[PDB]
Amino acid sequence: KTPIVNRAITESEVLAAQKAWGEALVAISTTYDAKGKASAKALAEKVIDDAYGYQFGPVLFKPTLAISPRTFRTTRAGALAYFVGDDKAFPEDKGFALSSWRKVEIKNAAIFITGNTATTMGNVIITDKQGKATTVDKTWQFLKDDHGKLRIITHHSSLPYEQ
Amino acid sequence: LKTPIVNRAITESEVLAAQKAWGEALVAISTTYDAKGKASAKALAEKVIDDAYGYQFGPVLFKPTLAISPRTFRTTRAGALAYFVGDDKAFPEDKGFALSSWRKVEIKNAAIFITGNTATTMGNVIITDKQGKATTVDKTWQFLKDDHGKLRIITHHSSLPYEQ
Amino acid sequence: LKTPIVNRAITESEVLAAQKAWGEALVAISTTYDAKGKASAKALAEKVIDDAYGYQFGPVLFKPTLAISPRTFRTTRAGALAYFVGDDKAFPEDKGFALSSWRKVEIKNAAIFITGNTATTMGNVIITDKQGKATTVDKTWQFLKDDHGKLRIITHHSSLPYEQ
Amino acid sequence: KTPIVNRAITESEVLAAQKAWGEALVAISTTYDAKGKASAKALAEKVIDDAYGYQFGPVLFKPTLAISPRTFRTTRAGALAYFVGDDKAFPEDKGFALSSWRKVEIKNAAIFITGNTATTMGNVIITDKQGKATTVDKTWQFLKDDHGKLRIITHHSSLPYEQ
Numbered sequence: 290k291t292p293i294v295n296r297a298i299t300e301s302e303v304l305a306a307q308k309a310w311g312e313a314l315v316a317i318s319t320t321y322d323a324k325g326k327a328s329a330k331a332l333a334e335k336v337i338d339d340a341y342g343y344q345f346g347p348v349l350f351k352p353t354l355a356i357s358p359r360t361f362r363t364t365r366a367g368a369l370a371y372f373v374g375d376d377k378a379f380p381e382d383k384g385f386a387l388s389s390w391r392k393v394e395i396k397n398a399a400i401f402i403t404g405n406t407a408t409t410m411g412n413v414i415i416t417d418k419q420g421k422a423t424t425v426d427k428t429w430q431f432l433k434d435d436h437g438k439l440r441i442i443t444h445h446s447s448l449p450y451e452q
Numbered sequence: 453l454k455t456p457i458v459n460r461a462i463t464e465s466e467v468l469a470a471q472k473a474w475g476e477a478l479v480a481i482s483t484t485y486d487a488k489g490k491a492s493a494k495a496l497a498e499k500v501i502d503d504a505y506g507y508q509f510g511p512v513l514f515k516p517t518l519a520i521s522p523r524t525f526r527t528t529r530a531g532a533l534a535y536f537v538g539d540d541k542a543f544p545e546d547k548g549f550a551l552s553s554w555r556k557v558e559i560k561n562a563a564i565f566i567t568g569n570t571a572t573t574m575g576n577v578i579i580t581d582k583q584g585k586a587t588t589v590d591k592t593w594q595f596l597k598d599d600h601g602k603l604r605i606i607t608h609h610s611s612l613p614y615e616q
Numbered sequence: 617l618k619t620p621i622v623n624r625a626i627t628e629s630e631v632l633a634a635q636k637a638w639g640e641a642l643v644a645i646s647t648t649y650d651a652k653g654k655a656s657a658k659a660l661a662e663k664v665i666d667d668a669y670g671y672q673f674g675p676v677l678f679k680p681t682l683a684i685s686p687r688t689f690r691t692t693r694a695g696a697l698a699y700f701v702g703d704d705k706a707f708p709e710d711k712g713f714a715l716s717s718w719r720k721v722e723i724k725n726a727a728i729f730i731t732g733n734t735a736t737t738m739g740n741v742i743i744t745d746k747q748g749k750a751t752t753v754d755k756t757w758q759f760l761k762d763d764h765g766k767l768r769i770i771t772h773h774s775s776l777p778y779e780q
Numbered sequence: 781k782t783p784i785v786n787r788a789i790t791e792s793e794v795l796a797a798q799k800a801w802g803e804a805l806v807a808i809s810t811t812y813d814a815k816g817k818a819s820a821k822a823l824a825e826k827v828i829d830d831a832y833g834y835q836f837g838p839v840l841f842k843p844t845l846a847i848s849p850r851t852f853r854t855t856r857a858g859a860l861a862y863f864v865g866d867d868k869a870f871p872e873d874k875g876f877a878l879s880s881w882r883k884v885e886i887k888n889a890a891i892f893i894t895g896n897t898a899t900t901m902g903n904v905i906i907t908d909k910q911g912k913a914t915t916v917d918k919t920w921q922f923l924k925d926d927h928g929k930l931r932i933i934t935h936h937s938s939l940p941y942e943q
Contacts, residue, residue, distance in 0.1 A: 291725040291739075292854060294837040294933070296896075296923075297625035297732045345926060346785040347563040349574035351590050357613045360590055361562035361574060363783060381616075397619040398525035399511040401594075401606050404625045404732020405787075405896055406567045408594055408607050410513035410525060411619075426515050426524060428592055428609040430565075430572055432787075435836060435926045442565050442785070443572050445592040447611030449521045455888040455902075456691060458674040458770070460733075461788035461895045509763065510622040527620060561782040568788045568895020569624075569733055575782075599673065599763045606622070675890040677901035679917050685940045688917060689889035689901060726852035727838040729921075729933050731897045736921055736934050738840035738852060754842050754851055756919055756936040758892075758899055770892050771899050773919040775938030777848045780872075 298407040298433050303400055306340075306431050306439035307409060311393030313340055314415070317372060318390035322418070326387075330373045333386060337368045342432060342440035353425050353446040356381040389418040407431045408443070424449060462571040462597050467564060470595050470603035471573060474504055475557030478579065481536060482554035486582070490539060497537045497550060501529055506596055506604035517589050517610040520545040556580040571595045572607070588613060626735040626761050631728060634759050634767035635737060638668055639721030642743065645700060646718035650746070654703060661701045661714060665693055670760055670768035681753050681774040684709040720744040735759045736771070752777060789898040789924050794891055797831075797922050797930035798900060802884030804831055805906070808863060809881035813909070817878075821864045824877060828859045833923060833931035844916050844937040847872040880909040898922045899934070915940060 313336040321329035341348050347363035352371045355362065359379055362368045370379035372386040397411040413427045430443030477500040485493035505512050511527035516535045519526065523543055526532045534543035536550040560576040577591045594607030641664040649657035669676050675691035680699045683690065687707055690696045698707035700714040724740040741755045758771030804827040812820035832839050838854035843862045846853065850870055853859045861870035863877040888902040904918045921934030 291728055292838040293628060293728040293730070295628070295730045296836075297627075297730045299625075300621060300623075345787075347565075347783040349563050349565060349572055349592060351574060351592065351611070354614055356616060360576075360613060363563050399513050399527050400619055400621045401511075401513060402621070402623045402625050403567070403570045403596065403606075404734075406570065406732075408513055410515060410607065410609065412524075426609070426611070428513060428515070428607060430594070430607075432567060442567070443574065443592060443594075445574065445590070445609040445611070447515070447590070447609070448614065449524065450518055450612065451521070455891055456675045457791060457891045457893070459791075459893045461790075461893050463788075464784060464786070511620045564782055564784040566784070566786045566788045568897075570895075675892075677890050677892060677899055677919060679901060679919070679938070682941055685942070688903075688940065691890050727840050727854050729838075729840060731894070731923060731933070734894045734897065736840055738842060738934065738936065740851075754936070754938070756840060756842065756934060758921070758934075760894065770894075771901065771919060771921075773901065773917070773936040773938070775842070775917070775936070776941065777851060778845055778939065780847060 296405050296433055298402055298405070298431060298439065300400065300402070302433070302439055303402070303407045303409060303431060304395075307395045307429065310340055310429075310441070311395065311413075314386055314393060315390050317386040318388065321373070321384075321387050322389050326373065326375060329387065330369065330375055333369055333373045337365060337372075340441055341365075341368060342434070342442045343368070345432070345440075345442065348441065349430070349443040349445070350441075351445045351447075352385065353448060354385055390415055391418055392416040405433055406442070413446075459601075460569050460597055462566055462569070462595060462603065464564065464566070466597070466603055467566070467571045467573060467595060468559075470504075471559045471593065474593075474605070475559065475577075477504055478550055478557060479554050481550040482552065485537075485551050486553050490537070493551065494533070494537045494539060497533055501532050501536075504605055505532060506598070506606045507532070509596070509604070509606065512605065513594070513607040513609070515609045515611075516549065517612060518549055553582040554579050555582050569597055570606070571603075577610075623765075624733050624761055626730055626733070626759060626767065628728065628730070630761070630767055631730070631735045631737060631759060632723075634668075635723045635757065638757075638769070639723065639741075641668055642714055642721060643718050645714040646716065649701075649715050650717050654701070657715065658697070658701045658703060661697055665696050665700075668769055669696060670762070670770045671696070673760070673768070673770065676769065677758070677771040677773070679773045679775075680713065681776060682713055717746040718743050719746050733761055734770070735767075741774075787896050787924055789893055789896070789922060789930065791891065791893070793924070793930055794893070794898045794900060794922060795886075798886045798920065801831055801920075801932070802886065802904075805877055805884060806881050808877040809879065812864070812875075812878050813880050817864065817866060820878065821860065821866055824860055824864045828856060828863075831932055832856075832859060833925070833933045834859070836923070836931075836933065839932065840921070840934040840936070841932075842936045842938075843876065844939060845876055881906055882909055883907040896924055897933070904937075
């Protein structure tokens with residue numbers, strides 16, 4: 290068979306990367322519930338290093354519950370802080386991943402594959418240990434890196450508009 | 453003579469220009485309604501959506517600021533028009549976002565990612581009406597440079613800043 | 617219902633298909649000349665170049681196998697047509713490559729690189745005439761997937777194997 | 781100023797990467813003339829690691845003077861062998877870089893920038909220590925890697941057709 294390099298993203302790679310983020314959020318949450326803040330922060334660090342693209346420079350990350358001065362988490366510390374708190378530079382952050390999450394459901398509205406990147410827009414439903422479901426409107430953008438792995442370079446999460 | 457060259461890549465200046473052109477268009481639809489009423493605004497909004505968005509390629513990933521939780525994702529031209537100018541029984545909750553007498557748009561980028569043929573921006577956009585009432589949104593755009601070298605919106609996620 | 621999706625990426629199967637379609641086209645021009653003469657071949661070559669190449673975007677990076685050292689690079693539609701079918705005073709050394717009664721094209725890829733919106737192939741192509749005379753070339757193609765999802769040649773470098 | 785990531789290639793980046801290859805060929809050639817085969821092979825190894833993209837998988841490399849069985853140098857060893865010989869697996873290779881090259885001139889016919897990659901097609905003129913000029917027809921394709929540096933993923937070199 291002809292030796293090939295495929296820098297392009299497939300549908301199945303995008304769907305996998307969406308789930309992988311869900312699994313990573315939950316893994317952080319159950320690890321906090323079970324082993325405390327220090328173990329979660331260390332798990333969260335490896336998760337961000339793995340699934341995000343802060344290595345390339347800024348990530349276009351607007352987290353769901355980020356407050357109006359510190360809205361855009363363009364740095365690795367900004368992401369970690371949003372998910373597990375424990376950073377005095379982000380004093381409004383208690384840790385979004387620390388609410389005992391257990392189930393994440395992806396409901397895509399549309400996917401756009403532009404070759405090396407892919408953008409998804411739809412709903413994500415995050416359910417805690419007691420079945421308290423939070424619905425968010427989520428845009429992700431994935432870049433396939435030089436090692437063939439999908440990295441979040443864009444992450445816009447918003448609570449559905451009510452009024 | 454200079455080497456003939458095809459450039460499908462987006463530059464920073466093309467991205468900033470396309471951001472400003474969307475602002476100008478929102479304001480141009482808003483004044484045209486204040487000045488000449490619904491019909492004129494609608495016809496202008498239609499050319500704007502045909503020009504600045506990329507519904508020609510298939511669905512656009514458009515989550516508008518003030519879109520209500522059943523009709524959240526405007527993946528069709530009609531969805532986008534309806535959001536801006538209303539007047540569509542299929543989007544009954546849409547009075548028209550562009551019809552609030554908008555006069556100034558300010559772009560405050562936090563970050564830009566140029567992935568070659570496309571470019572994503574994230575940051576604040578501040579839209580101010582004739583009375584100086586400022587609406588601040590958190591906005592993500594993605595621009596694709598079409599076969600004719602013009603930047604088209606294929607992704608548009610706008611959200612009100614989270615208030616605790 | 618299935619999530620609506622835009623796919624501007626090229627797949628392996630799209631690349632192999634586009635390779636085979638170029639072969640089929642060369643053979644279809646060659647037989648059409650053997651069977652119906654110059655005029656018919658020319659009109660067919662024109663639709664082939666308009667279909668399979670990307671002169672619509674600007675220059676194509678086309679270095680044909682048997683192109684002579686003044687007129688080496690066929691960056692214009694006319695250059696490409698002339699190479700295949702001749703009949704152009706502006707390319708006086710061109711008898712027409714496609715007019716040698718070609719009947720079989722075999723693609724032997726050494727490697728494929730899909731860079732997302734484009735895909736490059738390098739390897740051998742073996743073009744055999746009505747008498748079974750095999751011409752082997754070393755060939756590089758680059759395909760771009762246009763706004764309509766069809767693969768267009770923007771790069772075509774063909775060379776006779778180096779003989780010491 | 782807004783923090784930005786630019787995975788796109790500019791005209792000036794392509795022109796630089798074309799010259800950089802010229803400089804690298806010559807550097808190998810003068811290093812052989814002056815310090816012998818071992819020093820050139822070691823310089824040539826770092827040159828290929830740097831300017832080519834064998835890290836991603838196969839490179840679409842058809843060298844000017846490569847012979848009909850071993851035409852396509854899809855492996856790092858194939859490239860090294862073509863440029864400096866000294867590999868019994870490529871027995872027809874004496875070393876293309878070992879002919880005392882001194883001047884390389886790029887004459888582009890056309891450049892196509894497809895975002896993350898750029899293809900050049902034109903002439904390259906390589907002149908030795910005595911002014912013996914070899915003209916080649918050259919296609920290059922450059923991919924900007926995750927670290928912002930241009931890497932040759934395609935290299936088709938042919939002697940101009942004579943007859």
